[PDB]
Amino acid sequence: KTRIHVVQGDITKLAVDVIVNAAAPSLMGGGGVAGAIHRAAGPALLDACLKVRQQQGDCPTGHAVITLAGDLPAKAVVHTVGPVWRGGEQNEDQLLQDAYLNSLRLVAANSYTSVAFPAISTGVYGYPRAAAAEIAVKTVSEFITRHALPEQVYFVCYDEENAHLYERLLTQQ
Numbered sequence: 001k002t003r004i005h006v007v008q009g010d011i012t013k014l015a016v017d018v019i020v021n022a023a024a025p026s027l028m029g030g031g032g033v034a035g036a037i038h039r040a041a042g043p044a045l046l047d048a049c050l051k052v053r054q055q056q057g058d059c060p061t062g063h064a065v066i067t068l069a070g071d072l073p074a075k076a077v078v079h080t081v082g083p084v085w086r087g088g089e090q091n092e093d094q095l096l097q098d099a100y101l102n103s104l105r106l107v108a109a110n111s112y113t114s115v116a117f118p119a120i121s122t123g124v125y126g127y128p129r130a131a132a133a134e135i136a137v138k139t140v141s142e143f144i145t146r147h148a149l150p151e152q153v154y155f156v157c158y159d160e161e162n163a164h165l166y167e168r169l170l171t172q173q
């Protein structure tokens with residue numbers, strides 16, 4: 001689209017309004033993007049995530065929260081919790097959808113115009129890469145069709161295989 005883009009590389013480098021984190025309910029850092037993001041952002045991010053936890057407890061699956069972004073070139077970080085993949089009969093598809101939706105909603109609610117997304121749930125949470133990307137693209141596309149904000153959406157893909165996957169699902173629209 002004019003509004004949705006596929007970029008390949010490291011999400012932490014993206015100068016966008018908001019960067020999206022594939023988080024765990026704890027919100028306390030992790031391995032995949034979560035680690036990359038935290039490391040890049042610096043200690044302020046963690047302090048902020050603590051404050052949130054302190055205030056709302058664990059972030060439930062399919063939901064999302066927004067914080068400052070510290071040393072990141074972004075203005076804010078949205079932490080969202082993807083589902084753990086359990087074979088597809090445990091409402092996973094819906095919950096992944098919700099993750100994308102609630103994220104977008106928060107970006108908008110906070111008057112942000114641009115947002116970057118990683119491939120939520122496809123790493124350690126073990127979501128089949130292809131089914132996931134389908135939901136991501138469908139959900140985001142349908143949403144931006146209904147809404148002025150966010151104006152710009154970036155799908156950040158960590159490898160070429162995934163990048164191509166997205167790139168063509170997008171043309172399937």
Ligand SMILES: Nc1ncnc2c1ncn2[C@@H]1O[C@H](COP(=O)(O)OP(=O)(O)OC[C@H]2O[C@@H](O)[C@H](O)[C@@H]2O)[C@@H](O)[C@H]1O
Nearest residue numbers: 011022024030031032033034036119121122123124125158
């Ligand atoms: N710097 C990066 N930029 C963009 N994408 C990345 C990066 N590093 C990894 N990825 C990709 O981000 C996607 C997200 O998968 P994960 O980061 O493993 O997160 P997720 O599957 O949603 O499960 C999250 C779980 O792992 C921890 O990282 C996190 O705290 C939580 O416990 C995967 O495609 C992974 O390749």
